């Protein structure tokens, strides 16, 4: 028992990080087979990033202008192209440590692990959620761009995020591995509007199930509710609507604990209307929404990866 | 910016995990050079663990009774010995992925990353603190024993923890890599007394500095205090005494932010006496004590590892 914020093991991704330098700008790249993927603003000077024309800047670059280093070994760049907001550098050497992998675009509310890197070297690993407003609350410093987010399925690494930028309130934004931004953002140093964020209801419910599995059961009440009535109450507290798809995804946790999803919704409704009365759930004094139903299952049932 | 619970990258440790089976009991082992380290209760049946005589049980085992698997490859055991609560299995093959490493015994209040494993395979990574009562609040299921805790310094893995047992309130206990337990515990399935836990004061202060570095500054007051006067107040709230050694360790964060350690102590004192008035610090509604001063520095300054 016990329940912690848990990341995927990072080793398979560690084997793919390199550093990419163009002129005087250095950031991280992801080396898979004979291609290195990295954020396109590696080609910018500081002045360029206030209003860059990326197509124009790349025109004046040739292959040899990109210094790619995998450890102390330089990887010769033999081609390059730009795909939305990422650059793809073809190199003369395939990465022998390339894992089985896919590029996926995750949905809001879904979680992933981030391997935060500087100069091509890993610094740490943490877990994040894609917020409903398509930001993430990460931890990133200068030089972190090209750090990736991922999930693991047995032996397959699903890469879902590459880091590009920080809005001055500690809110982070980036792209999938095809270079398309999550959310209505662009890779330019200028002020930009994000949507109001909301609470990921299905994840809160998953975490309440984790609490029950771990013996923290005080908030369970004797009532049920309808899905409509719960959603009306949750709207007022800036919670996302709970859909039948969400109810179906919660089925394994409901079956394991013997608590109907709508009964847990009745317990959450009381918590929203009355507060926690100074109490904690799984050590937290707030309702936690960055654990998915699968996160709870893989932690509480010990799923491993090859 | 941003501040998250961050683990060390786990790849170097992933390369060292194997599974160890003796009879019908299977758990994890740590394979370094030509030695596999694992908890000694791998030699027990379920009945044995209620009151085991480990020396007696090991007498009747020979090398061939230990099945060690590194992936799908069996490692031939060619010798064995027991060191306190860990077994050491000599194998005929040195692990080619052995990193630079040390075995260290950490002090209470110090943190480490745990790579939770089942059947020799990694499931996830999370960060833990050695509590003042020598327990940890981990997340561990059946088969997790032999999972290790560690810190990383550039390229050197400092192994500090191997997991052995859970007390029925989700409290975990284990040994250093010489098999000596942290705390007054033994590897027997019987009820055992742990000390009252306390709050790690120097870590709370480190986390308040992390808050200031990230722009969360509302709790800073205009007062200072003496070390004596602060410790008198913190005693009442079950906080560990703050020592001059602690004050010295906080120096880098104090210098970076320009807030004297005793001035931060004055701010913490007000928080203890008055509460947070419904407010959060770095997203938390409680004071957090599982970040060390070094944890804050390595996250907020982007220290990497080879
Ligand atoms: C990549 N190495 C960095 C990661 C940043 C650095 C500080 N925290 C992070 O996450 N990415 C950048 O520096 C990008 C990059 C130009 C400027 N930038 C920003 O993140 C800036 N933010 C924005 O411009 C805003 F607000 F629109 F998001 C900055 C003010 C420097 C934090 C480009 C090409 C967007
Ligand atoms: C190693 N694979 C497991 C890890 C346990 C399993 C559940 N959560 C964990 O952390 N270690 C054990 O099963 C050890 C082992 C016998 C029994 N045991 C326990 O952890 C038990 N706890 C205690 O006996 C207590 F309370 F004293 F800590 C159990 C009740 C099964 C949780 C031995 C040899 C101690």
């Amino acid at each position: 028992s016990g329940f912690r914020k848990m990341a995927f093991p990072s080793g398979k991704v560690e084997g793919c990080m390199v550093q990419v330098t163009c002129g005087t700008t250095t950031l991280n790249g992801l080396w898979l087979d004979d291609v290195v993927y990295c954020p396109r603003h590696v080609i910018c000077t500081s002045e360029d990033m206030l209003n860059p024309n990326y197509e124009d800047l790349l025109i004046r670059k040739s292959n040899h202008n990109f210094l790619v280093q995998a450890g102390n070994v330089q990887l010769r760049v033999i081609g390059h192209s730009m795909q939305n907001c990422v650059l793809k550098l073809k190199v003369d050497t395939a990465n022998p440590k390339t894992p089985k992998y896919k590029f996926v675009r995750i949905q809001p509310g879904q979680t992933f692990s981030v391997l935060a890197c500087y100069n091509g070297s890993p610094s740490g690993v943490y877990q994040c959620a894609m917020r409903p407003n398509f930001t993430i609350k990460g931890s990133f410093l200068n030089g972190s761009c090209g750090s990736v987010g991922f999930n693991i399925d047995y032996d397959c690494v699903s890469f879902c995020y590459m880091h590009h930028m920080e809005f001055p309130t500690g809110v982070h934004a980036g792209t999938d591995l095809e270079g398309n931004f999550y959310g209505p953002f662009v890779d330019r140093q200028t002020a930009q509007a994000a949507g109001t964020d909301t609470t990921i209801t299905v994840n809160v419910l998953a975490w309440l199930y984790a609490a029950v599995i771990n013996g923290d059961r005080w908030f369970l009440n004797r009532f049920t509710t309808t899905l409509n009535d719960f959603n009306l109450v949750a709207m007022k507290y800036n919670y996302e609507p709970l859909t039948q798809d969400h109810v179906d995804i919660l089925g394994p946790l409901s079956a394991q604990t013997g608590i109907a999803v709508l009964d847990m919704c009745a317990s959450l409704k009381e918590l929203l209307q009355n507060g926690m009365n100074g109490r904690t759930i799984l050590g937290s004094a707030l309702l936690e929404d960055e654990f998915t139903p699968f996160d709870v299952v893989r932690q509480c049932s010990g799923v491993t990866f090859q």
Side-chain angles (χ1 to χ4, degrees), chain A residues 1-153 155-216 218-306:
Chain A
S1 87
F3 198 76
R4 284 226 181 240
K5 192 63 73 43
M6 189 174 314
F8 285 98
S10 61
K12 297 54 53 201
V13 179
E14 288 170 54
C16 303
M17 313 303 300
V18 302
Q19 65 174 317
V20 180
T21 302
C22 189
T24 188
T25 301
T26 299
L27 50 62
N28 306 285
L30 183 68
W31 181 25
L32 300 170
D33 293 328
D34 64 344
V35 177
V36 174
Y37 307 75
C38 73
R40 61 181 178 171
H41 75 247
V42 68
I43 64 180
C44 295
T45 69
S46 306
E47 201 191 4
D48 286 320
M49 302 153 183
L50 302 156
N51 209 340
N53 180 332
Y54 286 106
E55 288 86 351
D56 181 51
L57 298 176
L58 191 55
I59 297 180
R60 319 137 190 300
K61 291 313 177 147
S62 76
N63 293 329
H64 201 255
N65 303 158
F66 296 96
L67 166 60
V68 182
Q69 296 172 101
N72 60 341
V73 173
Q74 161 171 17
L75 304 181
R76 185 161 191 100
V77 168
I78 66 173
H80 68 273
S81 74
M82 173 185 34
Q83 177 175 12
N84 302 310
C85 297
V86 298
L87 300 188
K88 304 193 280 195
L89 309 170
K90 204 183 190 203
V91 288
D92 72 357
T93 302
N95 178 1
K97 296 194 234 223
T98 299
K100 189 178 188 319
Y101 75 90
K102 298 170 291 140
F103 291 169
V104 309
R105 187 164 177 92
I106 57 165
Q107 279 258 282
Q110 282 185 344
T111 56
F112 51 97
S113 301
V114 169
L115 180 68
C117 298
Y118 301 87
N119 302 297
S121 295
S123 174
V125 65
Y126 53 84
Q127 194 92 344
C128 281
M130 173 77 45
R131 303 296 318 166
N133 69 353
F134 296 102
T135 67
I136 70 178
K137 316 159 298 183
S139 171
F140 290 117
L141 308 167
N142 286 317
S144 62
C145 291
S147 297
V148 298
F150 62 97
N151 284 279
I152 300 202
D153 311 1
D155 60 335
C156 182
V157 180
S158 287
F159 293 106
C160 57
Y161 179 86
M162 170 161 295
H163 183 56
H164 291 249
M165 80 204 273
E166 181 183 303
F167 290 96
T169 165
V171 199
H172 300 102
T175 67
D176 62 22
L177 268 292
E178 301 186 320
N180 291 307
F181 261 93
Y182 292 101
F185 311 119
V186 301
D187 48 345
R188 182 193 163 187
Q189 189 176 314
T190 193
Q192 293 174 57
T196 188
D197 197 31
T198 65
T199 298
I200 306 144
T201 309
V202 64
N203 288 4
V204 176
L205 289 160
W207 176 79
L208 293 178
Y209 279 106
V212 171
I213 287 165
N214 286 88
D216 223 347
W218 63 265
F219 54 84
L220 293 175
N221 66 25
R222 64 201 190 271
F223 307 115
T224 197
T225 181
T226 72
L227 187 63
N228 283 341
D229 281 323
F230 170 83
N231 278 326
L232 267 174
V233 163
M235 182 166 63
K236 328 201 260 225
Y237 297 98
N238 197 32
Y239 271 57
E240 290 289 283
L242 193 76
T243 71
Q244 186 59 227
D245 279 359
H246 293 150
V247 175
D248 290 348
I249 286 142
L250 286 166
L253 290 168
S254 180
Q256 159 169 5
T257 64
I259 298 162
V261 170
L262 293 177
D263 294 4
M264 194 67 84
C265 285
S267 289
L268 175 51
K269 176 166 101 183
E270 182 177 333
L271 287 165
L272 290 184
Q273 289 173 326
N274 302 340
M276 281 136 96
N277 282 20
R279 306 197 60 170
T280 56
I281 297 170
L282 286 172
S284 173
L286 303 162
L287 302 174
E288 169 68 50
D289 76 344
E290 293 205 352
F291 293 96
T292 68
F294 178 69
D295 290 340
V296 176
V297 166
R298 66 147 164 130
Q299 172 162 178
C300 299
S301 86
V303 167
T304 54
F305 308 98
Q306 279 329 86

